[PDB]
Design a protein around this ligand. Structure first.
Ligand SMILES: Nc1ncnc2c1ncn2[C@@H]1O[C@H](CSCC[C@H](N)C(=O)O)[C@@H](O)[C@H]1O
Lengths: 265, 265
């Protein structure tokens, strides 16, 4: 009579940790959500096969409004698991579900899985150099989100890199590409005109991290804004001032233009 | 012709991903390094038995100075794995290892695993609010390094959280405790008197992340500085101003005093 929050990792069913798999195999009931991120290399069927259980998938409303009425009841009698893409507590509000579990008298445990937040290390950029992170959200109606632009500005003034989670509307099967996030940023730039994101800004794209062949590309917005980075999910990074070894990696591994090697210390 | 960078995850031998395990098993040769960190919840013997391969351990000098003479040669006609604690490439120097593989005409792929960078999401603190990260180093001889103190100050004045890695002598297996880190910081505060770390500063201590029973504690320095957080490894975090949901989690899950919901929000 326990609840496990188990991450499924970055790309496919095998990105689950061994810990997570052996525990999920022995749970009486398994629930999951696939709206906080997209695992482009697997299916519900392959996940069910691996864990050997029937997974019931919940929507954002099931989780946000009825988690305590749908999942918690069973965890009082049984050992229940709640699976999520990547790490369950990164760039989600699932941490709060722990609090609901405690007041329902249910003990909860967390099994981590690889997360996009640390997988950025594959870009060659020093992970300690990342500053505040932000989310590029799709505009809707007359509401046009722009706070993520200011995040970039603040980080870059400090010489820190900016990680940008891209929006996702899983019920619409919509996954924001790096391209779309660049276009949105250029628009915010025309408006605020702070010189923060232009045709000359160096960016880094990481798509489908976790796969054996993720797309890793670095370059100026003018040259990458229309490039095909493959299927989602995508993440966009606006680097701060680069260390030489960072630049060397972006060039050798991410095909960045030779000219970024000459940093302006 | 292939080199696999495989992460071992956070604490024990089950923290490797299913993908990482299966690939490691199909490799002709398996190397590991334990100089960037250790896997405090297991042993080399137990990891070897899980992988079903003898594992040759490499020292810092093995890697930094002779990676191309020890590892790359076998990867020319074999499948070779290089295991590292946490998520590969999060350690500042390992990304350039990929460049060496390239220069030697060797294919390389990265198999991710949970990292402390994402795992701290279990503290209930929003991942996006973390700013620049740093390492607390022991002073020694005539050298008193204090840059980590400066990192806290510039993150906190922007309302950002500071993730602090604590000094480790992997080879000697000596860990800096969160307690020592706190006293260190208090000493640096008395030196710089910038009002960044005092008895009244709120901190979060995460110990043995990855374990089913990690220690997560939150409170003021004056009450936590002599408390026993258990066995290493310890991670220290100095949160910036909290969102109410953050504070509620710290109170409900990490045993923080109610006081923070009116003092640090
Ligand atoms: N494998 C992957 N490759 C690239 N971006 C990814 C990714 N997985 C997640 N993301 C990014 O993160 C967003 C979801 S945010 C939720 C993240 C998740 N808890 C984790 O730990 O990874 C996506 O819209 C996308 O921009």
């Amino acid at each position: 009579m326990v609840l496990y929050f188990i991450g499924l990792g970055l790309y496919d069913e095998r990105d689950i940790t061994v810990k997570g798999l052996e525990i999920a195999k022995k749970c009486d009931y398994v629930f999951a959500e696939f709206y906080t991120s997209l695992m482009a290399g697997t299916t519900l069927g392959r996940i069910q096969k691996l864990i050997g259980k029937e997974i019931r998938v919940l929507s954002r409303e099931d989780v946000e409004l009825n988690f305590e009425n749908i999942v918690l009841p069973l965890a009082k009698e049984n050992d229940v698991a709640f699976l999520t893409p990547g790490d369950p507590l990164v760039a989600t509000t699932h941490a709060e579900l722990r609090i609901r579990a405690k007041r329902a008298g249910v003990e909860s445990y967390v099994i981590h899985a690889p997360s996009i937040y640390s997988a950025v290390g594959i870009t060659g950029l020093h992970i300690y150099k990342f500053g505040k992170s932000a989310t590029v959200a799709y505009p809707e109606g007359n509401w046009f989100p722009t706070s993520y632009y200011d995040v970039i500005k603040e980080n870059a003034e400090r010489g820190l890199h900016t990680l940008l989670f891209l929006d996702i509307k899983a019920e619409k099967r919509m996954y924001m590409t790096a391209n779309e996030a660049m276009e949105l940023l250029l628009k915010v730039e025309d408006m605020k005109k702070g010189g923060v994101f232009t045709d000359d800004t160096l960016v880094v794209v990481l798509a489908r991290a976790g796969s054996l062949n993720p797309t890793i590309r670095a370059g100026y917005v003018k040259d990458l804004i229309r490039e095909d980075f493959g299927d989602p999910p995508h993440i966009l990074i606006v680097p701060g001032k680069l260390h030489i070894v960072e630049a060397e990696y972006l060039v050798e591994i991410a095909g960045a233009p030779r000219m970024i090697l000459r940093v302006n210390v």
